[PDB]
């Protein structure tokens, strides 16, 4: 009952760190990892993919999206540009992912005082895009597990409908 989940977004927002915090629970300043969780009383294996710093030289590959049922769009709350770029990522993902894939918006680095994107702004963009929103901190381990459990539950719902 594997669930393929992708982390997408501008380089530098903290994608690889969120994944490391979730699987290993660590932070420090074969492109996937596995972690098994329980969903509605059933063991679910999450196959979590990390871009491998390749979003800097070319668009996401086809086989990358193949089988992906969850796609997490991440931006940096301290970097306006990465937030503005979310619309482009959303477009790219929609023009290539399965029609039933569930998306989720994550505003990362909520621990930083240098924040320039407010929670209200993130919530507003998520609403406009029609997807759930979560603010996290891979550094302080804030809401990281929630990202994956929230997304996994939404995916389990689509599968059963």
Ligand X SMILES: Nc1nc2c(ncn2[C@@H]2O[C@H](COP(=O)(O)OP(=O)(O)O)[C@@H](O)[C@H]2O)c(=O)[nH]1
Residues lying near a copy of itself in the complex (CB under 8 A) are found at: 1-2, 26, 28, 31-32, 34, 37-42, 47, 52, 54-58, 61-64, 66-67, 78, 80-81, 90, 94, 112-116, 118-120, 129-134, 143, 145-146, 149-150, 153-154, 157-161
Tell the smallest beta-carbon distance from residue 120 to a copy of itself (Å). Answer: 7
How far apart, in Å, are the Cα atoms of 142 and each of 18, 56, 88, 138, 150?
A: 10, 27, 27, 7, 14
- Closer Cβ to Co ion, 8 or 125, answer by number: 8
- Under the binding rule (CB under 5 A), the answer on residue 111 touching Co ion is no
Taking CB within 5 to 8 Å according to partner kind, which of ligand X, Co ion, a copy of itself, none is near residue 127?
A: none
106 marked ligand binding residue: no
How far apart, in Å, are the Cα atoms of 85 and each of 13, 74, 75?
A: 12, 10, 8
Strand partners, 34: 47
Of residues 20 through 39, those in contact with Co ion by CB under 5 A are: 25
> Which residues, in sequence order, are CB contacts of 60 under 8 Å at separation 6+?
8, 51, 92, 93, 96
């Amino acid at each position: 009952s594997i669930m393929k989940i992708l982390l997408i977004g501008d380089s530098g927002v903290g994608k690889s760190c969120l994944l490391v915090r979730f699987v290993e629970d660590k932070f420090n300043p074969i492109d996937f990892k596995i972690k098994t969780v329980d969903i509605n009383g059933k063991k679910v294996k999450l196959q979590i993919w990390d871009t491998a710093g390749q979003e800097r030289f070319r668009t996401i590959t086809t086989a990358y999206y193949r089988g992906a049922m969850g796609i997490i769009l991440v931006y940096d709350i301290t970097d306006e540009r990465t937030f503005t770029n979310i619309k482009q990522w959303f477009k790219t993902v929609n023009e290539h992912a399965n029609d039933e894939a569930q998306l989720l918006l994550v505003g990362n680095k909520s621990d930083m005082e240098t924040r320039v994107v407010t929670a209200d702004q993130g919530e507003a963009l998520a609403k406009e895009l029609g997807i759930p929103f979560i603010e996290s901190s891979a550094k302080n381990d804030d809401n990281v597990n929630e990202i994956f459990f929230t997304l996994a539950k939404l995916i389990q719902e689509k599968i059963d409908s």
